Assembly symmetry: D2
Homo-oligomer: 371 residues x 4
């Protein structure tokens, strides 16, 4: 059977990134779902049509076409505008059309090898006994698989409480049954670190030297949405969380895929599935960012992430598939919002988990409508 792959990219650029992204996608026959926004210029639509007649199966639904679909599914207020949260439209469209693989990318992640789509098809491998990687502290640093200067770094969304003692953790590999459903490809150039790390050492990923790994049950690593393949069964749990909720009056941002990466990861391991890190590797000539503005956006989420990850360890989930498990996860987040203690847990911070949980069940309700 032929594996179908759909690449999802939301962007506000002029479409010039298609010149380097299309070749690997066009040669493999994969579909590219470009999600524009209201603040997206008309040059993107002209760039999609130019690459469409070059052989690329690219679609670029206008904001009017996106809103009509979301209104038919009784979720007109779920996905906001002027935000990269609109990539959920691409997730939904690729899921309705029955694609096997959904590859989430940004407009500044460019494949480096011809087998980019083939490597991401590993999420359709199925269960089989394979070498699995476990860590004594329950955390794995995927940036250790890369050659990074000037010093060692951690990925964005990695819990800070476990960073100092992670160097003494024991990494072991064992032959165990595993079912890879999420494949987080690595990145060269500017690695996916938080604004804290980028402001401190300005890391530069030189090469991919560690190969690929599959994480065992209990070993976690943050998964982003800039070079990540998700099997269609696991896609219901890959909802990009809506940002903007204030923490002590400071609205959070840039962590929509940090939560989605951990949410689909804890849902996968509950269902006997695993997350893979490594190939395919992409180039990340990162778009220009105000690093102090990125820091101001991420800190509200960083202040809560360690506590959320700690409570998720002690909260067992229920469900037979990803829809039931993700909805069970949403109820667990509401229980965590009331038991967690900390100086950063103001009433607006606790209410952030409650509104997020409602939006998660609103996302699953839309998927159950098309199904």
């Amino acid at each position: 059977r032929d594996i179908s792959t759909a690449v999802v990219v939301t962007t506000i650029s002029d479409g010039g990134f298609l010149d380097r992204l299309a070749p690997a996608l066009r040669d493999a026959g994969a579909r590219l779902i470009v999600i524009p926004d209201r603040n997206t210029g008309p040059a993107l639509f002209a760039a999609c049509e130019r690459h469409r007649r070059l052989g690329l199966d690219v679609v670029c639904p206008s904001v009017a076409e996106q809103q009509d679909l979301l209104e038919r599914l009784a979720v007109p207020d779920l996905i906001p505008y002027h935000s990269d949260n609109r990539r959920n439209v691409g997730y939904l469209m690729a899921w309705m059309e029955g694609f096997d693989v959904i590859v989430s990318m940004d407009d500044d992640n460019l494949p480096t090898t011809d087998d980019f789509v083939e490597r991401h098809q590993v999420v359709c491998q199925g269960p089989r006994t394979q070498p699995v990687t476990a860590s004594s502290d329950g955390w794995f640093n995927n940036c250790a698989l890369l050659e990074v200067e000037p010093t060692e770094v951690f990925p964005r969304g990695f819990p800070f409480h476990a960073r100092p003692a992670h160097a003494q953790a024991r990494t072991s590999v064992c032959e165990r049954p595993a079912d890879v459903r999420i494949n987080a490809g690595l990145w060269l150039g500017d690695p996916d670190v938080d604004a804290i790390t980028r402001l401190a050492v300005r890391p530069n990923a030189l090469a991919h030297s560690g190969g690929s790994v599959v994480l065992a049950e209990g070993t976690w690593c943050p998964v982003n949405a800039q070079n990540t393949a998700v099997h269609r069964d696991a896609l219901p749990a890959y909802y990009f969380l809506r940002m903007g909720q204030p923490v002590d009056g400071v609205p959070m941002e840039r962590f929509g895929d940090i939560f989605s990466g951990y949410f689909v990861q804890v849902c996968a391991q509950h269902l006997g599935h695993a997350v893979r890190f490594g190939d395919p590797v992409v180039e990340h000539p990162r778009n220009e960012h105000d690093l102090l503005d990125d820091l101001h956006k991420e800190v509200p989420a960083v202040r809560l992430l360690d506590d959320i990850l700690d409570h998720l360890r002690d909260h067992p989930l229920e469900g037979g598939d990803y829809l039931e498990t993700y909805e069970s996860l949403s109820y667990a987040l509401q229980e965590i919002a009331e038991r967690v203690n900390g100086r950063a847990w103001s009433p607006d911070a606790r209410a952030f988990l409650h509104r997020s949980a409602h939006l998660m069940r609103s996302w699953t309700g839309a998927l159950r409508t098309v199904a």
Copy 2:
């Protein structure tokens, strides 16, 4: 059958208010459930024991006894301390002990007649054809039943959008079947107005001249918790909402009973029940308050109340009893939080309804545990 009545009062005073509250409660054999807090002095416990040996069936469970009960019901974080929200403990205790009538009062509401408890027993009257009062605009002003100087006023929690045109509304009385389950007694001296009205005209309620009324379906009026009797069947919907959630960064307060008054009211009319206003009347020598501080607390809730009340009109509910209806109301509030539009509906304002809905279902879950 003898009707059982339990009066619930949470306070941080020294207990001197018992000298005028006990006579009407003691002569009727009603129980008084005083709910202290961590910021409550020991003089209250000595005042309860002094009145207990005078004939009053008064109980004053310590914060250790309250927390033990709430922990046994799997709700240790539901009711916060240093807040008048602890009156929910009195609601829960009176409901577990099987009291027919639950009368919510404050420590500055003093009965004026000997039949205070007997008048509040009207919530056990049952269904019968009685004169019911309807208004063309769907709103009733209970302060019009009082002689107020220097001008006409509206009760606290009355929607502001309907105040200017309420004078032209048509009030009609018709003989219809009604089942009174909530009785909001009126107040003399300082009436229950919002800080806007109290700062503007400083109203003084002189006498109760309008008698008593029972409101028909579609006619609403805010119900407070300072002189209100609730039948035990309707008590599950009388949960005092938790305050402190910020609206555009400003934490709301003083509207815990505004929401509970409207919530139990919309739940009652869905179940074919009605709300009564009038006797018994109490004196309100209001405690000393910083009126500008009261205003700063109420404004965050005032900015949202009109929109919430508008959407509740167009949202039909489900349920066979008050537990099912209140839980259905909690889900309706979450749908309203995403459809409502307005300048005051910041992400923290929308998340206020989501966390409140979770706390409402957490309150119903505790009632289902003892049941």
Copy 3:
């Protein structure tokens, strides 16, 4: 003896208000300085030219002409756009051109009599023995000069702490030397009350029945900028204060003329000058406003006004003219910002008085440049 009058109005309307404002100004030969903004449509410029051809000495400098003037005076950042603070440009222009009387008005205040300009010329009367009105509590309610329904009201900016006991205050009139330099004309229709009063009673001013008064030293009343004449000597202290400073994170608005009215009033009394209230009376068909939004804007300033007014009584001022006295007042506000105590005096609230003081001295610095 040849008195010149310039009227200052800043607006974002289409200029239709000129149809009822021009006749009284055109017959008296007074100049109208209309200050447009960036959010002002082009119809206002066409309305000014249409009325200019009818005989009205009206000027309407574009935002480019305003910014060039403010840049030549080394104050390019003093006056913001998208704000009614731009009336300070009109204050500055009328002062540079040597006008004797500067009448501050809004686009919804319309004269009711033909002698509108002549009555406002009372600020050029000079010192003389005249009936002077004093109050035992130090406050005068100018709304008592009007017939107001449905109840008695207080003007916007009146201290709330002195309202309840003001009815017991003794009002006496004596023949004393006085020099009227500020004349606050009254308003029919919608009186100038705060949002607290307008939301509570919705006042309607029927007629001007109390005549005119001149307040003694030690008797204060807030002076707005919608129908107020200021002598050119007192104009340097009439700087419309810049709004937007947060108080506990809540930005203040609608009180720029409340401070300017009190500031020019305490400066005038220090120099032996007085404030007049009464004629000329204008009609105020108030523009449409979101009253709950007006409340949310005014509360931050209302929380601090009573304390600021109390300290201005204890603080003696220095200076020989309005420029020196206004600067001395600016330093006094900085001393008050550190000695005042209260729950509403967060660090941002105290810093509001410091930035306001610098902007006051920046306004006087620009006036010293043209002089």
Copy 4:
């Protein structure tokens, strides 16, 4: 020639740090001024008396003695409690008593050599031709004088915009006249980096390998208050800035010595004086800190520091001594607060520079009172 040295430390510890701090201070006959706070336990007072009997000239004035002193100098509200800002009391006391050298330290900075006081006496050296260090980019990284693992770091308060291109900057040493008035000793163990750096790489200072340098005019480096000697002439410009002012609603902290270090540095260079970095080196077993809480406190100041430093380059100062120059700097900060542009410059951020400027002049006013 008979040089007096007073060490200033404010602390809430139990006084155990005196065991390792007294020997170097006691052998040199220097005075130790310990400034307790309201949240300081009584064990500190017992530790000071225990070390006083051992020969250490240590004083520990109670909060009542501090407040009496600050009240006599007409500055009772300048220095808040429950804050390390109370070291300004120690700065004031050491200045009133005529000490030549004022060494600012914290309770976790411990001398490593016997000549600790003698090395800090370099601020009494006077003008002479000496090796002076200049940098092409105008910045010097004093952490480059240390052996730091695992990677190169920048000191706390170093501008982030100049960090990437600083490696390409040219460092030259020339024989020029210089007058050292501030000597910033270095620190082993935990270096003085911001929370961004400490969270990212967790630096560890191994040894002092770069020697000592004296910076030229136009070469800046942040100066902290944990191991810094200031000549008594330069002490008036060393006022520890008061924290707590919100930036976009987020109160700043931990940067009181970042401003004081830059302020005393720009004042010294205007007067022909210089700043020295190097010996004496102290050990810094840093007190336990919540690093994410340190980050949440520092970000508000980090968002504004690069812009403030850029404008201080363009702003010329006036004055003959440090008092006149510091006051001239205070007025310069007010001009900068209105001309600076950026996303982080909300009204509360601009007003922070205005209230800080008034507090700077309030500090100089108290110094002019004792003089």
